[PDB]
Design an enzyme around this catalytic site. Sequence first.
Site, short mmCIF file in Angstrom:
data_model
loop_
_atom_site.label_atom_id
_atom_site.label_comp_id
_atom_site.label_asym_id
_atom_site.label_seq_id
_atom_site.Cartn_x
_atom_site.Cartn_y
_atom_site.Cartn_z
N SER A 49 -11.15 11.88 -3.49
CA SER A 49 -10.71 11.54 -2.14
C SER A 49 -9.19 11.26 -2.20
O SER A 49 -8.59 11.22 -3.30
CB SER A 49 -11.48 10.34 -1.61
OG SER A 49 -11.17 9.18 -2.37
N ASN A 63 -7.34 9.83 -5.57
CA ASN A 63 -8.23 8.98 -6.33
C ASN A 63 -9.09 9.80 -7.27
O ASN A 63 -9.26 11.01 -7.08
CB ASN A 63 -9.10 8.18 -5.36
CG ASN A 63 -8.27 7.30 -4.42
OD1 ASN A 63 -7.48 6.48 -4.87
ND2 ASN A 63 -8.44 7.50 -3.13
N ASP A 95 -12.26 9.94 -7.62
CA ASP A 95 -13.41 10.57 -7.00
C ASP A 95 -13.04 11.78 -6.15
O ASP A 95 -13.89 12.31 -5.46
CB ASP A 95 -14.22 9.55 -6.19
CG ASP A 95 -13.48 9.04 -4.95
OD1 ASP A 95 -12.30 9.36 -4.74
OD2 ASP A 95 -14.10 8.28 -4.19
N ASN A 154 -8.43 6.02 3.44
CA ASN A 154 -9.17 6.93 2.59
C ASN A 154 -9.95 8.04 3.27
O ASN A 154 -10.68 7.79 4.23
CB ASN A 154 -10.09 6.12 1.68
CG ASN A 154 -10.70 6.94 0.58
OD1 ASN A 154 -11.84 7.36 0.68
ND2 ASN A 154 -9.95 7.18 -0.49
N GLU A 177 0.83 -1.20 0.00
CA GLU A 177 0.00 0.00 0.00
C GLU A 177 0.87 1.26 0.00
O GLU A 177 0.64 2.17 -0.80
CB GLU A 177 -0.92 0.04 1.22
CG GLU A 177 -2.10 -0.90 1.16
CD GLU A 177 -3.19 -0.45 0.19
OE1 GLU A 177 -3.02 0.57 -0.49
OE2 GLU A 177 -4.22 -1.15 0.10
N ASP A 184 -5.81 8.93 -0.24
CA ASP A 184 -5.41 7.88 0.69
C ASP A 184 -4.20 8.40 1.47
O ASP A 184 -3.29 9.01 0.90
CB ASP A 184 -5.02 6.61 -0.05
CG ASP A 184 -6.08 6.15 -0.99
OD1 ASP A 184 -7.26 6.08 -0.59
OD2 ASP A 184 -5.74 5.88 -2.16
#
EC number: 3.2.1.17
Length: 129
Positions: free
Chosen positions: A50, A46, A48, A59, A35, A52
């Site tokens: 958002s 991301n 959308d 998120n 990750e 991480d």
Amino acid sequence: KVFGRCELAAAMKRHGLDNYRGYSLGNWVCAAKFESNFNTQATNRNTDGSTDYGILQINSRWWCNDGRTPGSRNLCNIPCSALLSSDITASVNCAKKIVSDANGMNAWVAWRNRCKGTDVQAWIRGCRL
């Protein structure tokens, strides 16, 4: 801070992740590896809108507040920047709430795709735990 494999394993164990909700330590280390590559400062945006955050790429749409994710929920009650700290306590406590959700560790795409069903024990081999 970029963690060492065994270093991160030990901090994770200390914080109570070994076998939390049935997931052995090897899983959590593997997930962090893929990750964020053991970097507490990792961020990824991301499609959308958002983002991480941290070692476990938590998120902003649901778990933390970054002030720029319209409709975010902030379920862990923390500014997303707290997840980039060299002290992984916040990340761990929030991860504990995420994994407790209906989907378990499948909430982490990297775990699902690169750790799930592999010899995860390899990730802690050689560590004094």
